């Protein structure tokens, strides 16, 4: 992915391809779009946003009062 995003903003590419996934069945790195693994946008956006909402409330606690 490092060399894939170098020529991406230039709107020109030769060997640069994006969307490299991880295939654990065959043990090799292939594109998950052709491999058949796809996820909706609603699933990823709400999972990333809600993960930080619970992380903030934990870091804001400097004191624990228990009777």
């Amino acid at each position: 992915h490092a060399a894939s995003q170098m020529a991406k903003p230039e709107d020109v590419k030769r060997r640069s391809y994006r969307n490299y996934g991880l295939d654990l069945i065959r043990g090799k790195i292939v594109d998950e779009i052709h491999a058949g693994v796809l996820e909706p946008t609603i699933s990823k956006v709400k999972s990333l946003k809600s993960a930080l909402e619970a992380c903030v409330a934990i870091l804001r606690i400097d004191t624990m009062i228990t009777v």
Partner: protein, 465 residues
Amino acid sequence: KPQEVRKANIIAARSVADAIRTSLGPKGMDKMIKTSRGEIIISNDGHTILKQMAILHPVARMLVEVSAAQDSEAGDGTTSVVILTGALLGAAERLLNKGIHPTIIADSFQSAAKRSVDILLEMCHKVSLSDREQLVRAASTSLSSKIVSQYSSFLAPLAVDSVLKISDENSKNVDLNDIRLVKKVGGTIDDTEMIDGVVLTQTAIKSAGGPTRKEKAKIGLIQFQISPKCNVLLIQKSILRDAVNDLALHFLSKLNIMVVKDIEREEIEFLSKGLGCKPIADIELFTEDRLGSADLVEEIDSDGSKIVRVTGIRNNNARPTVSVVIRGANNMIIDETERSLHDALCVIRCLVKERGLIAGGGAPEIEISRRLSKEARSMEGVQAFIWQEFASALEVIPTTLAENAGLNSIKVVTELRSKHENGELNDNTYEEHILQPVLVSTSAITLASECVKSILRIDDIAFSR
């Protein structure tokens, strides 16, 4: 060692102020408190923390009474008044090591608090209640701290127009308990009815024979209950026995007398004030002179509410007591809206009792500390050194705001003393629409002088039963 026992209470009091210190400001750190009953609550409000903290320390409980009076008078600054109290206690620790008696320490706070208010009024911009453009922008900024934002545009004139009717002139303290926020299920935020006469909490009779509406009615308050020229009567809600018999509903229906039963016991004291009536315990003492005056009494239901409104009390002793109606779909709507508009009424209440406003964010605390440092040379003796320590104790509020916001502690504080020298109240929070009323900064210093005084005056404690 009577003084060493008091020093143990001062250290215990400063430990409570350090816990609340992290919660100051909207960026402050939350505090987790687990009640003995098992309820788990968390919030950044200092008034809710000290209320459920269940402090067993006798001197540390004074901060709860000051925080209660801070919300009852100014309505804002319950967190900052605790930090300001702990600053004077820490400054008095070095005074006791020099052989200074706490009486001089407590007496100098009276002259320091009165001088700090007079200096604050010099830099304060005097405003008048006749300008409605200043009150709308003042209450609208207080509503930006809640989830409701775009819907707060219609809520700004709601709180302004309600106070201006009861403000009159030279009213001094204006009790906000007479202003009731009615929370009903259903509707939306944009749907609101002022109904300046009065608003009840209860519905009307759903059985057969109930008129539910009456013209030219007299509304009395009857604590009695009917069980085995008065147009409208109120019956106190009692779950023990029956409130109003079904036969009594048919009897008063033939007499053209509107009946509203199941009146909440909490509103009995509220209705006895705004309506200007008196409670009737027994029918033997029940007369016409204890009734009210209403031109029209009707039941208007926007959606599902079925609420009765009354207008035109026209009482000489009573005043135009206004009850605000709030509608919403989810329960979390009318709830958060209630606490948001309550803080907006407190900010407006500060301007009615004391005219003028200042820019918040610790701006006046920097200049007051600079002026008292130069004016400290005009005094002589032990009291002169107290003015220097009192000015340093006022810098804890702006320092904590810089710490809880992630900015560098010592760096931001130095930038305040540098910019405030050439300009006056220009640092820019006025461009950011940050306005803190002068009564909050005045009451925070006044209550702190009395709180620290009540602390140092206790030289010992013993078992009393």
